[PDB]
Amino acid sequence: MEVRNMVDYELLKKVVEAPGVSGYEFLGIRDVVIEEIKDYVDEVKVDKLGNVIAHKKGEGPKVMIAAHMDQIGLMVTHIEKNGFLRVAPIGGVDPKTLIAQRFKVWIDKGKFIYGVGASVPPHIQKPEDRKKAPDWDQIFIDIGAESKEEAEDMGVKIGTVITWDGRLERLGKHRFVSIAFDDRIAVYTILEVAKQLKDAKADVYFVATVQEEVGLRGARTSAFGIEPDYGFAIDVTIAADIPGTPEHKQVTHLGKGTAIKIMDRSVICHPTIVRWLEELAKKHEIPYQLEILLGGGTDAGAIHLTKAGVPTGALSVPARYIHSNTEVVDERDVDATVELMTKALENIHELKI
Amino acid sequence: MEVRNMVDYELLKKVVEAPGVSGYEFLGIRDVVIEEIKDYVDEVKVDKLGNVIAHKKGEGPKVMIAAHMDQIGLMVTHIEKNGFLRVAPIGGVDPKTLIAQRFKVWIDKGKFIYGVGASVPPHIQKPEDRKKAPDWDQIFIDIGAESKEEAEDMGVKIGTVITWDGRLERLGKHRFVSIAFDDRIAVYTILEVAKQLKDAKADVYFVATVQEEVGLRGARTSAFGIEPDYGFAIDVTIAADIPGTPEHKQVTHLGKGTAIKIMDRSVICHPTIVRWLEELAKKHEIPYQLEILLGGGTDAGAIHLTKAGVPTGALSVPARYIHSNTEVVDERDVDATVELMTKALENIHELKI
Amino acid sequence: MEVRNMVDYELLKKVVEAPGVSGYEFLGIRDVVIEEIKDYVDEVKVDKLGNVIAHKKGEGPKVMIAAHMDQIGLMVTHIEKNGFLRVAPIGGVDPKTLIAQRFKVWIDKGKFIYGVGASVPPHIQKPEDRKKAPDWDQIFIDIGAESKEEAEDMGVKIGTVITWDGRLERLGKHRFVSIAFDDRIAVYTILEVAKQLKDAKADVYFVATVQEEVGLRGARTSAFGIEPDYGFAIDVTIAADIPGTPEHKQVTHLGKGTAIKIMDRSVICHPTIVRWLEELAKKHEIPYQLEILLGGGTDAGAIHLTKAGVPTGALSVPARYIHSNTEVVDERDVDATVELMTKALENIHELKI
Ligand SMILES: [Zn+2]
Ligand SMILES: [Zn+2]
Ligand SMILES: [Zn+2]
Ligand SMILES: [Zn+2]
Ligand SMILES: [Zn+2]
Ligand SMILES: [Zn+2]
Secondary structure: OOOOOOOOHHHHHHHHHOOOOOOOOOOHHHHHHHHHHOOOOOEEEEOOOOOEEEEOOOOOOOEEEEEEOOOOOEEEOOEOOOOOEEOEEOOOOOHHHOOOOOEEEEEEOOEEEEEEOOOOOOOOOHHHHHOOOOOOOOOEEEOOOOOHHHHHHHOOOOEEEEEOOOOOOOOOOOOOEOOOOOOOOHHHHHHHHHHHOOOOOOOEEEEEEOOOOOOOOHHHHHHHHHOOOOOOOEOOOOOOOOOOOOOOOHHHOOOOOEEEEOEOOOOEOOHHHHHHHHHHHHHOOOOEEEEOOOOOOOHHHHHOOOOOOOOOOEEEOOOOOOOOOOOOEOHHHHHHHHHHHHHHHHHHHHHOO | OOOOOOOOHHHHHHHHHOOOOOOOOOOHHHHHHHHHHOOOOOEEEEOOOOOEEEEOOOOOOOEEEEEEOOOOOEEEOOEOOOOOEEOEEOOOOOHHHOOOOOEEEEEEOOEEEEEEOOOOOOOOOHHHHHOOOOOOOOOEEEOOOOOHHHHHHHOOOOEEEEEOOOOOOOOOOOOOEOOOOOOOOHHHHHHHHHHHOOOOOOOEEEEEEOOOOOOOOHHHHHHHHHOOOOOOOEOOOOOOOOOOOOOOOHHHOOOOOEEEEOEOOOOEOOHHHHHHHHHHHHHOOOOEEEEOOOOOOOHHHHHOOOOOOOOOOEEEOOOOOOOOOOOOEOHHHHHHHHHHHHHHHHHHHHHOO | OOOOOOOOHHHHHHHHHOOOOOOOOOOHHHHHHHHHHOOOOOEEEEOOOOOEEEEOOOOOOOEEEEEEOOOOOEEEOOEOOOOOEEOEEOOOOOHHHOOOOOEEEEEEOOEEEEEEOOOOOOOOOHHHHHOOOOOOOOOEEEOOOOOHHHHHHHOOOOEEEEEOOOOOOOOOOOOOEOOOOOOOOHHHHHHHHHHHOOOOOOOEEEEEEOOOOOOOOHHHHHHHHHOOOOOOOEOOOOOOOOOOOOOOOHHHOOOOOEEEEOEOOOOEOOHHHHHHHHHHHHHOOOOEEEEOOOOOOOHHHHHOOOOOOOOOOEEEOOOOOOOOOOOOEOHHHHHHHHHHHHHHHHHHHHHOO
């Protein structure tokens, strides 16, 4: 029911249901992003590492727009004899998010079987009966096979194979969205940006990097061919407005405006950009916050290290929950984010100093 | 009272009082370093990332001299309702150094208001009344404002804004200095070097890098434009001669000579350089130690990773205390350090092998 | 910038920079208080114990006005061989306030050398690496001397010698002050009172007692020669409006009005005085709080024990932080405190019952 048509409910479905580590047998997301973007951009290319490169042409400096598409997942490492799986996580995940339903196993493109991962048996002790946290060894997964032989006949093998099985639903039918955030909300901004951008006052290069959540320098490889002389990023990591907390996290997210990054673990944004975006949002009546973290590793950090020594600002689409399971967002912020970047790109020609 | 005129008491004042994260609204240190160095060097330039580049010209290999100017500081993240600030640290700091006086808030260049940060209230418990260590959440800061509105009318906003408010005083009027060490003692060597260097037997490039204490690869960006075929560094991290300790830390500092780095966490210095400097100090009767750490991240590590694969040695001006609050040094070592590098640079032409 | 001329910024400088244990070689504060007060009072005397006695003459009962001038400090107890000092505290101090800058050593009057005291090395253990609280043995101090011999040649000897090195700065240029509180804010009220008092309706005796923070009965000695038949006090000890706390401490200080003491550890104020001051502040539109503690030892307790059995009220100038390091105050309260006492003294003649 697109009362406003601000965020296309159909488009978000295509990207987010797709599996979130590319180049593997799951690589369909690559096709998806290029299947959309290419009609609005002059040319597009794929690097060796699974990165995607979209080059709109123009007159001006080279701007780099970075989003990550490496959604968290899990990896099978071996097959116990009873036909039940153990697993090893990809970096970033918290194991308390074991399951409530339906872990999906992507044997190959267009072939998925449902799986569950509920319980490593807690050890036998009385203080540990109170510690219902899972053991660190890691949790196990079930696909219902009785034996190792049956499991391999399905197609399960060792490899990075698994993901979370999200589906996109609407909460707060006034406005909010459930799982639209991690590793593709930024891309929706990018795609919406490409539709909204007509007059290229600066020659932009949209990238959608891989291996962000593990080895964030995955993004860096794309950078050198593309970046020089400016840079941007759209990644996120938040602890947002969870009740029972003090006010010191509340300003990170209140359900309002977009989030500019001044500081993270990795990156210290060149502050002229920040003050400029601050100026920009006020001129066009755009909402904005100023967010900082104590931790987290973003794409922007890898951009800062290319040989030119690039100055970088970063936007953030806020309001995540612990990024495994559900990933709430705000319809207002994402469309506002698009507006902001759209104007910044065109007005970048004056920013140069 | 410069009885010896070995270390100019006036010059050190200018650099160290200045605020220690550049590019921000505090960026005055940039002007300071170039305001001095430029009269003695042929040409000077500023990179995009806030790095400073001073290029003396000559006949020989390209030598790179690296010091950091990113003194530790703190960042406001939000504003509680009572007009009191919370904070988030920049990497490296220890929070037991909360305050004894006067945290300074650099709203903008030439505008500072004093602030205090003494106490997060310890939790209500009896073993914790004994644990007077601050909670890890982080400490809070006061500027005396009663409300959020009053605070923003001053000029306080979210951002990296704060520093420590050091001032330079003389202890052991025979010889020592109080806060002259961190993030500018190396620069004083550099500046003194530029005055002492007349005949450029090798074409040197003095850099003063930013974002060392966080994302040490901040220095790397300058490297590629400048470095090739040799490298040096002047950074420090020490646990020095604190009483009640064994002798295993005492050799790290005794109040004598300069410190050559063989090993750190990050960098393993190309040992030919080390043996050469060892040879050099003996030839000119210079004092020297040999220091190693188990931890710490220096500029030298980032130098080793540029594409040529550069060999690197590193000098250290010793005798720090836990780098937040007071930062004792030895007048003897710093002048000796200058002598050593001065001779090494000119004699580098024979080092090539 | 005395926009109001309510609190003289010059006067506070003289008292508070001075060293805060008298009779020692530091005793200059004694001269300071008498150098000011004597022009406005008929006569002044010094007792044997370092107490100061100022006797304005009049017609009425004998009123005693007590402030303490024994600011906290530290004492050297021995000299380790490496030229570094250990210390022993004076009562009241918390050792988590080790240093952030510049501990001052008063060898003698007008001779000071700066010192630092940062770190006792924490013991070697893993739960203790988390306990960054200092060991109770006590912290150590550095003055940069290499040996015991060098230290004594400076003038350092065993004795109570050390203080905190505060300096007075203005925060909240609308209104607040940094280190003006402990052991001399009360005296500024006293001095301001003496200027404001013209017509002595009761013969008052202003005292400035020593050895309050240790052996609070230090004040008592002055009492017997002076006190009989009434008594007052201006001392403080507070835990004030620190964020993250409940409301149960907030009324102790909110940045408003002065603080009357009903109860402490030591003293239970004769409540007729309290109700009278309550009545008084309402008649002249003066602001007031009512504050009580669970702990702390004030001058008033010692007054209650003189042979007559004196009834005593006590005023408090609020808003301290943990009294070692910074000592915030409110310009409004201190001037209001002066007004209150000024009127109470003259109207004491009706209070007698
Ligand atoms: Zn991570
Ligand atoms: Zn992420
Ligand atoms: Zn570090
Ligand atoms: Zn450092
Ligand atoms: Zn006490
Ligand atoms: Zn006290």
